[PDB]
Amino acid sequence: GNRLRFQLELEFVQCLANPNYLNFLAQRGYFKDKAFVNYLKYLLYWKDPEYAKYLKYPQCLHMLELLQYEHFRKELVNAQCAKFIDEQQILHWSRKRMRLQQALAEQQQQNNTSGK
């Protein structure tokens, strides 16, 4: 546990990112123990310069954010949510699409340039 609880949190969050994993946790039925409140905090320590230098899912933050405001825990009793919140993530997964297109326009605009 000595070296372990280290990676333990590491994961725990790292996966706390995916939201389902919330609802998993949620309709699972948990959210009633301050030990979660702490655990929030405990993790929450994670938001430190060193602290993330392993991390992989920069959702972690928003997680804590949400999962720091109990009201989230209140709300997430449901996956309807999971659509909505998960919907933003799917929409995000953007810049690559812009690359392919913003060029494309560059080219057309260039047709106009050559249109002169």
Binding site: A26, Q27, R28, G29, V77, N78, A79, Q80, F84
Partner: peptide, 14 residues
């Protein structure tokens, strides 16, 4: 938000 058929259940997951 409620785009469609507002009703969904807390965890009846089948």
């Amino acid at each position: 938000s409620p785009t469609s058929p507002s009703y969904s259940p807390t965890s009846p997951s089948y």
